Design a protein around this nucleic acid. Structure first.
Ligand SMILES: Nc1ncnc2c1ncn2[C@@H]1O[C@H](COP(=O)(O)OP(=O)(O)O)[C@@H](O)[C@H]1O
Ligand SMILES: [Mg+2]
Length: 429
DNA sequence: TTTTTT
């Protein structure tokens, strides 16, 4: 099935030595998130796959970085204390892992990598960066950046010159090679690739955007015989469209249950979970026993009182039960600080998958999509949504595509000049 | 106003 480009073998040779870290970039559809599936199948018996988002982790066969390394939400400064301790089952994992793969690195905060470094340096008991573990990063800096809430930026701008993964402070202590894939796969249309890559480079003309006028077509909603999908910029449109696609003339509501104090905004799951038979669903957590990792997709076969039966896209059937989330914070017992749980919520780890966010959709491939991008945005978000689909016809838009939707980021322009000046390499040598 | 733990 797969084709090995001259650059891919060239990339394969660079990582044959242990001491070289490599960042593999390329345009959307260049075959990077694919090529890493091909790399896993040779070197030693070691590798770990991970990504920032649960879905891109599924797309690469890995897990989330926060679940793998036990990273709490929010930035960790070098002065911040390490909150979570690895178990003995997890320590053997990281110790036996001789190679680390991070898919879709563009969405990774720089403090996360330094949290990876500090946790790897301690679990390996070594002063070498990342515990001396080889790291290979896949992603396109021109897709979209991480989050990057405003409260967390001013906090990180104390210790960090930039908010992008390469700004991490471990790159004072080490560095990485950069190789780009110049061949596109996902789209076979030459005129559609041209306008795509021009959306990516911020250099594009309104005569090329004329090609996207056909995306205003309302043509076919039908049918579920190979279906259709919605990708929205904001979670509110995803929330409405999923409920819009479920008429609720039929069936179930599943209510959450809260013990003690669990603030609304901090609740990870649905307060009232509404589902019918044949409803698109997404697994919200990781269970190795049942076998559903977070980010997987499925469809509801049956709805009972305490059990939901779902047939996943991978072909495996899972019976979902109620998952319990624990809310723990910092309080005072005795005289001392304590981690005690101040509340818990319980619901099924499922949510309606008909719609979705460009953020969650990054890395995915589709034959037919329905793009919702209105005039509301965040940088690089449009290039992602367009490039998900293989064909220009399969794309359906809510509104006309305008240059207003393009938000350039000039730090990526400077970063490209930097490493291309030295041997396609960034950081310390 | 977008994601993400043991
Ligand atoms: N070397 C390759 N050979 C054949 N098809 C490929 C190759 N690389 C990618 N593809 C195809 O391109 C599409 C998306 O691939 P993917 O690697 O996930 O995109 P990206 O490089 O932007 O992360 C898939 O349909 C895949 O089959
Ligand atoms: Mg990808």
């Amino acid at each position: 099935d797969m084709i090995l480009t001259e650059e891919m073998q060239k990339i394969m040779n660079l990582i044959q030595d242990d001491e070289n870290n490599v960042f593999v970039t390329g345009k959307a559809g260049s075959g990077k998130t694919t090529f890493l599936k091909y790399l896993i199948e040779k070197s030693g018996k070691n590798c770990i796959v991970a990504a920032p988002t649960g879905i891109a982790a599924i797309n690469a066969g890995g897990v989330t970085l926060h679940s793998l390394f036990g990273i709490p939400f929010g930035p960790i400064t070098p002065y911040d204390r390490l909150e979570n301790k690895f178990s003995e089952y997890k320590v053997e994992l990281l110790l036996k892992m001789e190679l680390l793969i991070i898919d879709e690195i563009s969405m990774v905060r720089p403090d996360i990598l330094d949290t990876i470094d500090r946790k790897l340096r301690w679990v390996y008991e070594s002063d070498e960066p990342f515990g001396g573990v080889q790291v290979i990063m896949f992603g396109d800096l021109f897709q979209l950046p991480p989050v990057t809430k405003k409260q967390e930026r001013e906090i990180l701008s104390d210790f960090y010159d930039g908010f992008f993964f390469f700004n991490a402070l471990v790159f004072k202590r080490t560095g990485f090679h950069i190789v780009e894939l110049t061949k596109i796969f996902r789209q076979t249309e030459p005129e559609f690739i041209n306008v795509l890559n021009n959306i990516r480079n911020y250099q594009v003309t309104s005569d090329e955007l004329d090609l996207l006028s056909e995306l205003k077509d309302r043509k076919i909603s039908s049918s579920y015989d190979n279906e259709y999908i919605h990708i929205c910029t904001h979670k509110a449109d995803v929330e409405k469209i999923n409920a819009d696609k479920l008429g609720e003339q039929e069936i179930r509501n599943y209510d959450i249950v809260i013990k003690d104090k669990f603030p609304e905004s901090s609740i990870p799951c649905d307060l009232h979970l509404k589902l019918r038979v044949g409803a698109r669903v997404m697994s919200l957590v990781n269970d190795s026993l049942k076998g559903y990792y977070n980010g997987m997709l499925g469809i509801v076969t049956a709805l009972e009182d305490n059990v939901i039966t779902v047939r996943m896209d991978n072909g495996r059937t899972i019976k979902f039960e109620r998952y319990t989330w624990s809310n723990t914070q910092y309080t005072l017992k005795d005289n001392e600080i304590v981690k005690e749980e101040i509340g818990s919520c319980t619901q099924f780890p499922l949510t309606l998958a008909w719609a979705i966010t460009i953020h969650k959709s990054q890395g995915l491939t589709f034959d037919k999509i329905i793009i919702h991008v209105s005039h509301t945005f965040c940088p690089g978000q449009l290039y992602v949504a367009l490039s998900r689909c293989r064909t220009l016809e399969g794309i359906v838009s809510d509104a006309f595509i305008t240059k207003q939707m393009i938000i350039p980021e000039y730090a990526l322009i400077d970063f490209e000049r930097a490493y291309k000046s030295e041997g396609n390499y960034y950081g310390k040598r």
